[PDB]
Design a protein around this ligand. Structure first.
Ligand code: G9N
Length: 166
């Protein structure tokens, strides 16, 4: 793996929640929120509902959202990809759902390895993803511009968006 010398999210690919490989260069020109999700957390509802709200209000300006299920934080994403897809449909998710991945350790998805080492990808303590619903904001060139932690509701991202819609 060569993820350490990539300069953009657009260099990566990942399987969507149906199992189909997606080239992330399709997000060239778009502002993106990339987030790790889980279905069985106290903060699942607030995160899904607010992401849906942001997508509803900003998709017209080029906001896209990429949600990666992950079972590494309390084992609270135990379901199959098909089950998680249906779960997300219950919140009327219209953004992009991906297949379940790891975000930490040697088998972390390479996009996640890459985001964590970006200058604006470092967490408050360090690079490791700490819990469910970490959020990365990605500019139109696929560069990491901000990271928001598990404790930060997605609506805190809203005030930062206008700058990246130039
Ligand atoms: C996914 C998550 O954030 N989370 C969690 C929930 C449940 C379980 O085990 C059953 C585990 Cl290991 C982690 C949080 C959490 O949601 N805390 C709020 C209280 C709650 C809400 C709904 C369901 C169960 C608990 C936890 C992190 C540490 C302990 S619980």
């Amino acid at each position: 793996d060569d993820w350490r010398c990539a300069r953009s999210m657009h260099e990566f690919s990942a399987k969507d929640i149906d199992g189909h490989m997606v080239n992330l260069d399709k997000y060239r020109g778009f502002v993106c929120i990339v987030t790790n999700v889980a279905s069985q957390x106290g903060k699942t509802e607030v995160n899904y509902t607010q992401l849906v709200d942001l997508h509803a209000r900003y998709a017209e300006s080029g906001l896209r959202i990429l949600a990666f299920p992950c079972n590494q934080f309390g084992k609270q994403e135990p379901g199959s990809n098909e089950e998680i897809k249906e779960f997300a449909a219950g919140y009327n998710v219209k953004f992009d759902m991906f297949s379940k991945i790891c975000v930490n350790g040697d088998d972390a998805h390479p996009l996640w390895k890459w985001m964590k080492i970006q200058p604006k990808g470092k967490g408050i303590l360090g690079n490791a993803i700490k819990w469910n619903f970490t959020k990365f904001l990605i500019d139109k060139n696929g560069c990491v511009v901000k990271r928001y932690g598990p404790m930060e509701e997605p609506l805190v991202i809203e005030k930062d968006l206008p700058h990246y819609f130039h």
